[PDB]
PDB file of C-alpha atoms and ligand atoms in Angstrom:
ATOM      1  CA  UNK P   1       0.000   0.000   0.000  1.00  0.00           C
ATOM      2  CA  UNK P   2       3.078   2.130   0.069  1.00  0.00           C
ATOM      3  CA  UNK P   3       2.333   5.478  -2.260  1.00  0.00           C
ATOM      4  CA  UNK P   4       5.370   6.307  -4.312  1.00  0.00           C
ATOM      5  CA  UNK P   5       6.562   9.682  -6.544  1.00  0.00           C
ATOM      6  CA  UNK P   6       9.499   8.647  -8.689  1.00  0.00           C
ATOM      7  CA  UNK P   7      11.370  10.724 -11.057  1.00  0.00           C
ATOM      8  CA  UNK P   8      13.956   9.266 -13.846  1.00  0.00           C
ATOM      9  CA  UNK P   9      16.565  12.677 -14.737  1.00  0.00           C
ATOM     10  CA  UNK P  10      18.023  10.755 -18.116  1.00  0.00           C
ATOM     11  CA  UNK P  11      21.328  12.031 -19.649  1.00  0.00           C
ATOM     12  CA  UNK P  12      21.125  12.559 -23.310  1.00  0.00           C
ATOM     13  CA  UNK P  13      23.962  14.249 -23.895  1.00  0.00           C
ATOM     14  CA  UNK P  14      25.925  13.938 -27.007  1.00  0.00           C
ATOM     15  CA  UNK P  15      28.593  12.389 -24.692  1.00  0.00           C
ATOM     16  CA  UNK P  16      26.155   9.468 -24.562  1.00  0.00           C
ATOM     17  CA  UNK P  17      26.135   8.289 -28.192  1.00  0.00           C
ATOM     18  CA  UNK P  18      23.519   6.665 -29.996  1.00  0.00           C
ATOM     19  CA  UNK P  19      24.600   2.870 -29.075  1.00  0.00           C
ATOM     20  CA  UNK P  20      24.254   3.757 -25.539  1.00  0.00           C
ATOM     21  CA  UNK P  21      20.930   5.851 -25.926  1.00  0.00           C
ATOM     22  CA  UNK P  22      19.142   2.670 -27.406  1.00  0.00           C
ATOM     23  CA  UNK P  23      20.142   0.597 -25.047  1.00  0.00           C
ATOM     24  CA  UNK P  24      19.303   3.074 -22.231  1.00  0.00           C
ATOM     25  CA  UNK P  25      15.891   3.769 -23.605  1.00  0.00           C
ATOM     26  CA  UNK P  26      15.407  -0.113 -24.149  1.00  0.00           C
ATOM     27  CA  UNK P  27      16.879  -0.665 -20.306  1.00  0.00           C
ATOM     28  CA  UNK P  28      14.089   2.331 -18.771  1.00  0.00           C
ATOM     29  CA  UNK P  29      11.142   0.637 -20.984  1.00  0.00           C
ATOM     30  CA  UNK P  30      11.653  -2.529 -19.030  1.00  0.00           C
ATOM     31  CA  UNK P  31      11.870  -0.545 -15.511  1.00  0.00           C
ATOM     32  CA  UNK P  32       8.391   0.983 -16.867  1.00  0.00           C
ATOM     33  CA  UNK P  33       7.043  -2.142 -17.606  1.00  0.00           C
ATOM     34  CA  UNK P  34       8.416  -3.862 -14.226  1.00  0.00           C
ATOM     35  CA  UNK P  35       6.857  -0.521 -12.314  1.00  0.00           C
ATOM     36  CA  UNK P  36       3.318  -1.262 -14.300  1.00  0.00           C
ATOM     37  CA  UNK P  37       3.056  -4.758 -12.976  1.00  0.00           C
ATOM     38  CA  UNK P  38       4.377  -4.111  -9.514  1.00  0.00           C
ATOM     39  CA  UNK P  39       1.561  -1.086  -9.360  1.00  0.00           C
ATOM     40  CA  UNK P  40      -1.263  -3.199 -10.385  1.00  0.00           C
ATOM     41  CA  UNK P  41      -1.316  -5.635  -7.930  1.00  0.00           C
ATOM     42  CA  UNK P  42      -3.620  -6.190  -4.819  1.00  0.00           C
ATOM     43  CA  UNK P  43      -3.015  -3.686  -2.475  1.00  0.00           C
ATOM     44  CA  UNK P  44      -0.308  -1.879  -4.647  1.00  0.00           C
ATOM     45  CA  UNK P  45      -0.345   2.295  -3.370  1.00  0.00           C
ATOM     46  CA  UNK P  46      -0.487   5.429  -6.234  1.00  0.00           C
ATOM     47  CA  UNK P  47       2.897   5.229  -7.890  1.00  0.00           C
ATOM     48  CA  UNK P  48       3.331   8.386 -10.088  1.00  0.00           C
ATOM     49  CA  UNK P  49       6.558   8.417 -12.235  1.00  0.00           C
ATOM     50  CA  UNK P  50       8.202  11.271 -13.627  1.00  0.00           C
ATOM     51  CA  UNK P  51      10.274  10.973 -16.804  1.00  0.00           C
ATOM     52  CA  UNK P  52      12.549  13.808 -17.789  1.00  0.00           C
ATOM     53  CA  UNK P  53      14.944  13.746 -21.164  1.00  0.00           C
ATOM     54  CA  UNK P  54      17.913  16.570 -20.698  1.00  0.00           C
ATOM     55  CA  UNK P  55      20.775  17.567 -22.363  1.00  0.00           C
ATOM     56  CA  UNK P  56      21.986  21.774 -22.905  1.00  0.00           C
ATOM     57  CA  UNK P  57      18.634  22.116 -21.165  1.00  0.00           C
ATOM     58  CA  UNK P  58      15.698  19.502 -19.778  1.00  0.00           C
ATOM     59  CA  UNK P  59      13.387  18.669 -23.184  1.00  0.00           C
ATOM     60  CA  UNK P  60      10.134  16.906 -22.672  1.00  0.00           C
ATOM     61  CA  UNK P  61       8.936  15.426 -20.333  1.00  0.00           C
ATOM     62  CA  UNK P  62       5.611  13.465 -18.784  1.00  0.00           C
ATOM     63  CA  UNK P  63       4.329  12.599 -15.509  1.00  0.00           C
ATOM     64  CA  UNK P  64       1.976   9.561 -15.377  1.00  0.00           C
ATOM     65  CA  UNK P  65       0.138   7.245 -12.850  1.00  0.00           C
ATOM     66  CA  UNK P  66       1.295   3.723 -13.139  1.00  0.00           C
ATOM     67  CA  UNK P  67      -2.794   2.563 -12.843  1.00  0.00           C
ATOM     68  CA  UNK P  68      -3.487   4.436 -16.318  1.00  0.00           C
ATOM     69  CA  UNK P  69      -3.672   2.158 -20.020  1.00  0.00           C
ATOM     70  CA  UNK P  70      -1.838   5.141 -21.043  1.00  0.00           C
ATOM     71  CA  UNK P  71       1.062   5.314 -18.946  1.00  0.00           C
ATOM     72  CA  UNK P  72       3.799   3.280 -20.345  1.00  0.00           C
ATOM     73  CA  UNK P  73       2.317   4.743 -24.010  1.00  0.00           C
ATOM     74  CA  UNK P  74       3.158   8.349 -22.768  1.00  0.00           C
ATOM     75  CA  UNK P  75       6.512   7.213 -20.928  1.00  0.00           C
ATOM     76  CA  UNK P  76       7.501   5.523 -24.089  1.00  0.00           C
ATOM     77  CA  UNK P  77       6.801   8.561 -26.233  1.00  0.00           C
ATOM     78  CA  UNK P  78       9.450  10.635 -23.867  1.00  0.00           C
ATOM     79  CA  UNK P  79      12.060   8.050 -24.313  1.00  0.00           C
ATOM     80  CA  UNK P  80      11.579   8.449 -28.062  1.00  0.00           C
ATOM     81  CA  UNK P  81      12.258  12.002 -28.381  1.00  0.00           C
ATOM     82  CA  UNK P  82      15.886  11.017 -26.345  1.00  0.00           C
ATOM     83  CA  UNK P  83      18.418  12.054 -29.171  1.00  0.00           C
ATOM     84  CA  UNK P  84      21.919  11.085 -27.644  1.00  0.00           C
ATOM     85  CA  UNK P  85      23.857  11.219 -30.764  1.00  0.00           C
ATOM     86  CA  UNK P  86      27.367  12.804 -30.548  1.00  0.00           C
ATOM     87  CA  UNK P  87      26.296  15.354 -33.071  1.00  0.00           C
ATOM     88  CA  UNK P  88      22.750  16.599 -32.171  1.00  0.00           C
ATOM     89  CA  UNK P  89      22.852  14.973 -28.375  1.00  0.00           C
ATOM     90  CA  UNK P  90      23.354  18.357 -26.901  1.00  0.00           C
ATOM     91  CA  UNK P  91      25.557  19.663 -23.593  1.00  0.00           C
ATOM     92  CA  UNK P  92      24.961  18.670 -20.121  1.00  0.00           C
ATOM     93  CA  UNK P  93      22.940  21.017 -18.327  1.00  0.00           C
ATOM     94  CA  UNK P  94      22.122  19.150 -14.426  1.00  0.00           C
ATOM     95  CA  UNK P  95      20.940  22.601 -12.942  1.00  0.00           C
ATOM     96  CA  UNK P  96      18.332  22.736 -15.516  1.00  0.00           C
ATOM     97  CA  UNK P  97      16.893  18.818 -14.936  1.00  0.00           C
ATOM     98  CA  UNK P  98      17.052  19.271 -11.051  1.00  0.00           C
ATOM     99  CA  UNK P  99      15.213  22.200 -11.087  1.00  0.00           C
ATOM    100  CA  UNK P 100      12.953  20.830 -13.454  1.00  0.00           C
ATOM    101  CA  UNK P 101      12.165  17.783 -11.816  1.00  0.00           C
ATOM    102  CA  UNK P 102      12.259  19.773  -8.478  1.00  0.00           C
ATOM    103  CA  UNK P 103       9.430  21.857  -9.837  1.00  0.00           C
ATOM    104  CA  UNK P 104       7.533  18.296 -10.118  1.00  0.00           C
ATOM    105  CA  UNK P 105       7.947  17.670  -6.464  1.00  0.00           C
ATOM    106  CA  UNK P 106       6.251  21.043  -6.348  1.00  0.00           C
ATOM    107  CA  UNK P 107       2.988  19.402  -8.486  1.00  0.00           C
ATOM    108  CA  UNK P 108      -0.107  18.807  -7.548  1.00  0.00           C
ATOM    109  CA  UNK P 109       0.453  15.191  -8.641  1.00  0.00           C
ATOM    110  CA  UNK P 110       2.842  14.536  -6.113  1.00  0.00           C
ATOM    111  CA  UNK P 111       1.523  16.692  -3.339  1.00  0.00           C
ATOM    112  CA  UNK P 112      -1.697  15.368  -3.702  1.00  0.00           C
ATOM    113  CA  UNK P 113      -0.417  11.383  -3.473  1.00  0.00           C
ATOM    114  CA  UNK P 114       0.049  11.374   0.448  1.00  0.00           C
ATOM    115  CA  UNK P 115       2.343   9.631   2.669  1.00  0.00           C
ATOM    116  CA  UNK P 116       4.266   8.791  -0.561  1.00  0.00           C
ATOM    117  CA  UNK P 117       8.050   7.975  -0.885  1.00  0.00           C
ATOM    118  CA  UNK P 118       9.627  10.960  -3.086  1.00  0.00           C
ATOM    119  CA  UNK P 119      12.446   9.414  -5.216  1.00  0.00           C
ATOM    120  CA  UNK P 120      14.650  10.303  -7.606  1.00  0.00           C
ATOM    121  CA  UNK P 121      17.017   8.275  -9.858  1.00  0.00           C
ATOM    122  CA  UNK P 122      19.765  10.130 -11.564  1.00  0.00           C
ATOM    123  CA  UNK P 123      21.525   8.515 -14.644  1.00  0.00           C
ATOM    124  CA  UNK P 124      24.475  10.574 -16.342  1.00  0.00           C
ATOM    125  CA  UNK P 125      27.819   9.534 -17.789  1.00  0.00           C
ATOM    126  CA  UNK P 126      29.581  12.470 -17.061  1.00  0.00           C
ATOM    127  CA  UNK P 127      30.185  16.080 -15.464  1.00  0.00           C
ATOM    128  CA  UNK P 128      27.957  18.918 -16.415  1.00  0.00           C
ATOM    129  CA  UNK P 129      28.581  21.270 -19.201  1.00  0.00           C
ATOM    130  CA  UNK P 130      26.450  24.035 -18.913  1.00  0.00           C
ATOM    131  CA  UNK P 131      24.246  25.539 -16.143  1.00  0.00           C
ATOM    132  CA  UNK P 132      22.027  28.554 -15.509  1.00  0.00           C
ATOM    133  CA  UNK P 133      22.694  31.889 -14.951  1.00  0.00           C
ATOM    134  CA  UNK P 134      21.094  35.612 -13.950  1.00  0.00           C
ATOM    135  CA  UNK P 135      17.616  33.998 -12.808  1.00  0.00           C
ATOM    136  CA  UNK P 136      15.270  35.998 -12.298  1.00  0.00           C
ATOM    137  CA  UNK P 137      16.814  38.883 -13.623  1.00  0.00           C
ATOM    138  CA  UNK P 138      15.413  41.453 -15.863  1.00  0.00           C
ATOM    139  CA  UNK P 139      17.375  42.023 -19.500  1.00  0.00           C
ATOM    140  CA  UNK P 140      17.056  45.136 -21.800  1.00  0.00           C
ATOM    141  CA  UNK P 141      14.656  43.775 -24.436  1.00  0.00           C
ATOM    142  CA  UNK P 142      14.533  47.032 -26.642  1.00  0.00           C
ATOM    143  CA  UNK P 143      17.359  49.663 -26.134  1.00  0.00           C
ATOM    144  CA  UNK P 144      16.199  53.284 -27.113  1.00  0.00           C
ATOM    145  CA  UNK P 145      18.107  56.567 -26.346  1.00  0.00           C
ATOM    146  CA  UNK P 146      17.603  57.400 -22.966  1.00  0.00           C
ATOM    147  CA  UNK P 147      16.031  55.155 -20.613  1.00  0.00           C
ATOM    148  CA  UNK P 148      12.359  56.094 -21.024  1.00  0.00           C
ATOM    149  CA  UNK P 149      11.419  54.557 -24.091  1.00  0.00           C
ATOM    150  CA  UNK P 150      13.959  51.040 -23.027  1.00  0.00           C
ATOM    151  CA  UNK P 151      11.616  48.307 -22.791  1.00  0.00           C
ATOM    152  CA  UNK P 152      12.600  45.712 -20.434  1.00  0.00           C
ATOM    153  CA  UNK P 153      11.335  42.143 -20.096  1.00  0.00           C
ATOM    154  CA  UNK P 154       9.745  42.869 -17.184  1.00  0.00           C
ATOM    155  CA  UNK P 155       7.811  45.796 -19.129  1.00  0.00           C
ATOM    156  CA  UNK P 156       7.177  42.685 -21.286  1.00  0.00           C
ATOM    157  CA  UNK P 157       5.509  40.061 -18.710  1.00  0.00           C
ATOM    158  CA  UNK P 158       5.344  41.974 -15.561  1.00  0.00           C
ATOM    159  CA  UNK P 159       4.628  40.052 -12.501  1.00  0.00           C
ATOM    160  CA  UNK P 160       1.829  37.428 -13.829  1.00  0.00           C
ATOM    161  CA  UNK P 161       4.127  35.715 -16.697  1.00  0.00           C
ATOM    162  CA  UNK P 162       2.699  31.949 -17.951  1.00  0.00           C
ATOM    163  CA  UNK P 163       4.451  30.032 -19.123  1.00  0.00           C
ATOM    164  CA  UNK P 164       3.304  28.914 -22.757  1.00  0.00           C
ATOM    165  CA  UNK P 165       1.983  32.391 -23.534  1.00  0.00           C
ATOM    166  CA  UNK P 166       3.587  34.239 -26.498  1.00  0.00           C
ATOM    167  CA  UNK P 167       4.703  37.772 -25.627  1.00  0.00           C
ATOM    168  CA  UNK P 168       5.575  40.413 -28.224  1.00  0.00           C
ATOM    169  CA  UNK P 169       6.585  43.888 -28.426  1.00  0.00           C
ATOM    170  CA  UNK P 170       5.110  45.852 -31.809  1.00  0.00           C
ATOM    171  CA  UNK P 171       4.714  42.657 -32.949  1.00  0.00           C
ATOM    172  CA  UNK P 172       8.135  41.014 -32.696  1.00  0.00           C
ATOM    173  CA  UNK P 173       8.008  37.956 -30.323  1.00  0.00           C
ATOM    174  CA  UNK P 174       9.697  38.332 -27.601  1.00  0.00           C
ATOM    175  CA  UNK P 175       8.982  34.963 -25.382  1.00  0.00           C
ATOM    176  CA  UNK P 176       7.909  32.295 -28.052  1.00  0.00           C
ATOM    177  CA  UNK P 177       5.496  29.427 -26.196  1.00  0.00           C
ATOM    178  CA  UNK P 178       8.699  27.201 -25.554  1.00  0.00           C
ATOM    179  CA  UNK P 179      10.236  29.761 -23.063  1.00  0.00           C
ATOM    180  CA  UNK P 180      12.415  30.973 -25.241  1.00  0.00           C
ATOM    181  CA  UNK P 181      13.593  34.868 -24.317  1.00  0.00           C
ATOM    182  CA  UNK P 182      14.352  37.186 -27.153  1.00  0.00           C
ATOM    183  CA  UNK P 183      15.753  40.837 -27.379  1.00  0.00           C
ATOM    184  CA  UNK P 184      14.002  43.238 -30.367  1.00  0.00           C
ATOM    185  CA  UNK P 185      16.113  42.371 -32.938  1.00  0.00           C
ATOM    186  CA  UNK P 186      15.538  38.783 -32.944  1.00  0.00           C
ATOM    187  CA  UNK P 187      18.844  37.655 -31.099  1.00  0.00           C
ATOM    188  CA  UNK P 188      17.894  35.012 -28.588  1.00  0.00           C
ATOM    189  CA  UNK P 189      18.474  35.944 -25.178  1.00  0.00           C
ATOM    190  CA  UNK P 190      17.839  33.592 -22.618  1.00  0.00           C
ATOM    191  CA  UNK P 191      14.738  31.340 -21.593  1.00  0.00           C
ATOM    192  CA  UNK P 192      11.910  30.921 -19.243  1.00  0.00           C
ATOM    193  CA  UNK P 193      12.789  27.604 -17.142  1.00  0.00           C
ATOM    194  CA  UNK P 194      11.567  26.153 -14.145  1.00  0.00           C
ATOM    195  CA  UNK P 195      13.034  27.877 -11.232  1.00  0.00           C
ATOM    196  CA  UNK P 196      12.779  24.600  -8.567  1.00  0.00           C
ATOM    197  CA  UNK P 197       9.878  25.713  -6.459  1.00  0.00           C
ATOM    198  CA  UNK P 198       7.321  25.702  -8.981  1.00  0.00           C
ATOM    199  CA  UNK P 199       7.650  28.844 -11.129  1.00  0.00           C
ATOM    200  CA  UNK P 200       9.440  29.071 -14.619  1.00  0.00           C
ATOM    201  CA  UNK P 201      11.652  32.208 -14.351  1.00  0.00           C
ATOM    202  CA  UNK P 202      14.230  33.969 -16.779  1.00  0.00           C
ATOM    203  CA  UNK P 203      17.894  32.891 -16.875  1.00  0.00           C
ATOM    204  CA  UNK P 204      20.423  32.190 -19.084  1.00  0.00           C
ATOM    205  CA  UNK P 205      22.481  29.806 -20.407  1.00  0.00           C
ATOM    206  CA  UNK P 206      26.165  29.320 -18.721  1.00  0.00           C
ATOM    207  CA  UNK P 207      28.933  27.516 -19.686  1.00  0.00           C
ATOM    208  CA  UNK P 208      31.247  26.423 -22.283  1.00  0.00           C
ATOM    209  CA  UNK P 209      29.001  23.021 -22.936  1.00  0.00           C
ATOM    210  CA  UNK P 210      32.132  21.104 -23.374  1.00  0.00           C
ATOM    211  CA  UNK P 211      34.287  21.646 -20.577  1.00  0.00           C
ATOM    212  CA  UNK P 212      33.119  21.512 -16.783  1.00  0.00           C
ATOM    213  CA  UNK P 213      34.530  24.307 -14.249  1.00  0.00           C
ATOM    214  CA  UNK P 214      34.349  24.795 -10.788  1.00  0.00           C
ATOM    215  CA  UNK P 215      31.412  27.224 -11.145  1.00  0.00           C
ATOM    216  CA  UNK P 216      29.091  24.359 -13.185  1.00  0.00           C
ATOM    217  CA  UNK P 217      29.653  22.720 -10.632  1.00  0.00           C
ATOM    218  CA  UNK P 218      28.494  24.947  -8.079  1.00  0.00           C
ATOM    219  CA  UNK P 219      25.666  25.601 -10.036  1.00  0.00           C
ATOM    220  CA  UNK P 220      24.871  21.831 -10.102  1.00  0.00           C
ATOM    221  CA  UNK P 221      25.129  21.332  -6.902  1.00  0.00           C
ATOM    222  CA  UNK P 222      23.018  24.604  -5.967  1.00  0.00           C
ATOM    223  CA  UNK P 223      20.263  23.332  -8.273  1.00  0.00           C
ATOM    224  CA  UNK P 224      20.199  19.901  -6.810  1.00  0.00           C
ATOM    225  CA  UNK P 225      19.935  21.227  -3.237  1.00  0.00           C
ATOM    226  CA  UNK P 226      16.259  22.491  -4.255  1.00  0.00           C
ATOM    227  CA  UNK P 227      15.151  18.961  -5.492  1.00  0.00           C
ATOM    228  CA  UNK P 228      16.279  17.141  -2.109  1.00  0.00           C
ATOM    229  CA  UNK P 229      14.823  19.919  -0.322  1.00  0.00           C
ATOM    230  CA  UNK P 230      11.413  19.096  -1.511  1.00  0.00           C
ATOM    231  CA  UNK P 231      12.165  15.618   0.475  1.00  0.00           C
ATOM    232  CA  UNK P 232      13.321  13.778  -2.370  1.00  0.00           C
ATOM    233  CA  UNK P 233      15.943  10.948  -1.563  1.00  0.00           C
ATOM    234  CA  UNK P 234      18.164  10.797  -5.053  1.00  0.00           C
ATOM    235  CA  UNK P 235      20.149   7.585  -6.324  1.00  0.00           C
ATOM    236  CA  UNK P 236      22.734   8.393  -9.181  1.00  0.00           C
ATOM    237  CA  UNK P 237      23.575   5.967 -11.388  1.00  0.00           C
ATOM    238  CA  UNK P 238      26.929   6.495 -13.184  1.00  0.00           C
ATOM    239  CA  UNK P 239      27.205   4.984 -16.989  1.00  0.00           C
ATOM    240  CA  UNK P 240      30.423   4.398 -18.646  1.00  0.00           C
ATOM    241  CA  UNK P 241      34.137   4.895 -18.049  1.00  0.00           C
ATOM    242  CA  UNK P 242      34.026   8.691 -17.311  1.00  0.00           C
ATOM    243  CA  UNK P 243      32.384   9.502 -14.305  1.00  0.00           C
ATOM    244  CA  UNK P 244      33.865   8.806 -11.407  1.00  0.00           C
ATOM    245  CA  UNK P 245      32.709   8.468  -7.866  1.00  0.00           C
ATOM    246  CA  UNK P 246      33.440  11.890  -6.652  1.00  0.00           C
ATOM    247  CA  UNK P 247      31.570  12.991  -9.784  1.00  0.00           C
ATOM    248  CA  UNK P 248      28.596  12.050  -8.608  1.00  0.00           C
ATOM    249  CA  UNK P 249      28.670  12.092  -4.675  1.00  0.00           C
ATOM    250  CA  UNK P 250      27.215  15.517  -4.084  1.00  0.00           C
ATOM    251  CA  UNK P 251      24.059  14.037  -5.927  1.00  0.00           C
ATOM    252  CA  UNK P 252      23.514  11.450  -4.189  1.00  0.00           C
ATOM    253  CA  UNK P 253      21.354  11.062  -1.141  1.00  0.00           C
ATOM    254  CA  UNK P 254      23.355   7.925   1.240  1.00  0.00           C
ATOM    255  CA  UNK P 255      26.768   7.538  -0.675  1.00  0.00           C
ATOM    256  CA  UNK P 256      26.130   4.860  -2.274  1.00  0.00           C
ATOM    257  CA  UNK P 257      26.627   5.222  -5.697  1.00  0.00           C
ATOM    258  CA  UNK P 258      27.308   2.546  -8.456  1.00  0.00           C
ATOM    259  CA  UNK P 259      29.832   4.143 -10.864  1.00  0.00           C
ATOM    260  CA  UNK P 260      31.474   2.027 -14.113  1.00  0.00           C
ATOM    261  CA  UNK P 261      27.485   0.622 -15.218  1.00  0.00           C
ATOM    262  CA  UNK P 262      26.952  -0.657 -18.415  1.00  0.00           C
ATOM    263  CA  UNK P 263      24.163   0.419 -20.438  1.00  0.00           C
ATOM    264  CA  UNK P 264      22.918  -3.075 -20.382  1.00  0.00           C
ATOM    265  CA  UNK P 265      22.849  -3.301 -16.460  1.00  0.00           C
ATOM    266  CA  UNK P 266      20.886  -0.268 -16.368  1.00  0.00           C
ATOM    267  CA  UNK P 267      17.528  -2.032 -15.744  1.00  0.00           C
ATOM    268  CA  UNK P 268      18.558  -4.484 -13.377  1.00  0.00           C
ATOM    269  CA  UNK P 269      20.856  -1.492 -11.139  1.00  0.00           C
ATOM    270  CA  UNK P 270      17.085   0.439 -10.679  1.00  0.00           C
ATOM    271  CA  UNK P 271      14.812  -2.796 -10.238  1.00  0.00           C
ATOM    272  CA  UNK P 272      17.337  -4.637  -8.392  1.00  0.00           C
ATOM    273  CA  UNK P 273      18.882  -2.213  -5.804  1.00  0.00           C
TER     274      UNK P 273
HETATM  275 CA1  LIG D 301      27.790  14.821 -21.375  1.00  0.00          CA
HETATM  276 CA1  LIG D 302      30.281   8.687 -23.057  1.00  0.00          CA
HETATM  277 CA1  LIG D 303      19.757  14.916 -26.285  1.00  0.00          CA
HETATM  278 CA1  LIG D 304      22.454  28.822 -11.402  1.00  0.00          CA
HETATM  279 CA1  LIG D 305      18.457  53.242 -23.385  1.00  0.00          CA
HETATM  280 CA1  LIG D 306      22.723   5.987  -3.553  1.00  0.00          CA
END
């Protein structure tokens, strides 16, 4: 009868490579499928699961209730939209998935399934790339002479912004539906993500996306302290030959941390742990 929220944060990074991807997406279907049984038997509690995709930022993702015909079908679509090609896979942005998956622990989906467990399970094969910067802050959209003709985003969506809602400014969009942020000449700017308690909020894009410096990781492990602080107990799960131990300690909720996996033990390190 135990109630359970459980996330999956899945690195497609172009670090990953397409070999590994399949197998990965193959490895989580069978987790899914595992999950579905386990939830529909006698007694079973609400299991919600979470299923995130993210590489230079977090792409789609779907939250579903294990007792729905639907739920592996909507799961399944999110793992086909992973792209973890070395060409189009994209950088490795943590601070965006934790605060994206934070802002589920924020949903009414998981607040309203009581008593639940809250996990989280973390798979990566390496350090992060890029991060977010300047959140909340509030960039020049239009530059005019002067300062009382400037229009500034927050002239743009002032304190009620939604997310999905196209902005514009004499007709120029200025915050397509996706989030993205743009100034008045079309260059993009920076985005409208989730912020980790619920909100999506401006920031931009940091980092050199194929490099990782002391201040990505900062910003990794800032991001990640708002996902455990919703009461969310996180196992990582490093892939491959190139994340180590330490990589992955500060996101990781009791130290233990299997390191080294193959993509083809991914299944069996989740169901079996
Ligand atoms: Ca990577
Ligand atoms: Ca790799
Ligand atoms: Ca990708
Ligand atoms: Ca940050
Ligand atoms: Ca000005
Ligand atoms: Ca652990």
């Amino acid at each position: 009868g135990q109630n359970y929220n459980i996330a999956f944060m899945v690195d497609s990074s172009g670090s990953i490579g397409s070999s590994a991807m399949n197998t990965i997406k193959s490895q989580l279907a069978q987790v899914f499928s595992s999950l579905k049984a386990s939830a529909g038997t006698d007694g079973a509690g609400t299991v919600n699961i979470f299923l995130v995709d993210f590489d230079t930022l977090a792409n789609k993702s779907v939250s579903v209730n294990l007792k729905d015909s639907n739920a592996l079908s909507q799961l399944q679509a999110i793992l086909d939209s992973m792209d973890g090609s070395t060409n189009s896979g994209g950088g490795t942005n943590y601070e965006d998935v934790f605060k994206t998956t934070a802002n589920w622990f924020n949903s009414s989906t998981v607040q309203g399934n009581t008593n639940a467990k809250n996990l989280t399970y973390f798979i990566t094969d390496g350090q992060p790339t890029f991060y977010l910067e300047n959140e909340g802050s509030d960039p020049m959209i239009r530059d005019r002479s002067g300062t009382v003709n400037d229009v500034y985003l927050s002239n743009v969506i002032g304190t009620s912004y939604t997310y999905g809602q196209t902005y514009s400014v004499n007709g120029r969009t200025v915050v397509n539906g996706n989030g993205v942020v743009y100034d008045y000449n079309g260059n993009q700017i920076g985005y409208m993500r989730p912020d980790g308690a619920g909100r999506y909020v401006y920031a931009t894009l940091a980092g050199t996306g194929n490099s990782t410096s002391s201040t990505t990781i900062a910003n990794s492990v800032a991001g990640f302290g708002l996902l455990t602080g919703m009461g969310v107990t996180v196992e990582a799960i490093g892939l491959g030959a190139n994340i180590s131990y330490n990589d992955l300690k500060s996101y990781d909720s009791d130290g233990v941390i299997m390191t080294g996996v193959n993509a083809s033990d991914l299944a069996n390190a989740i169901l079996g742990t």
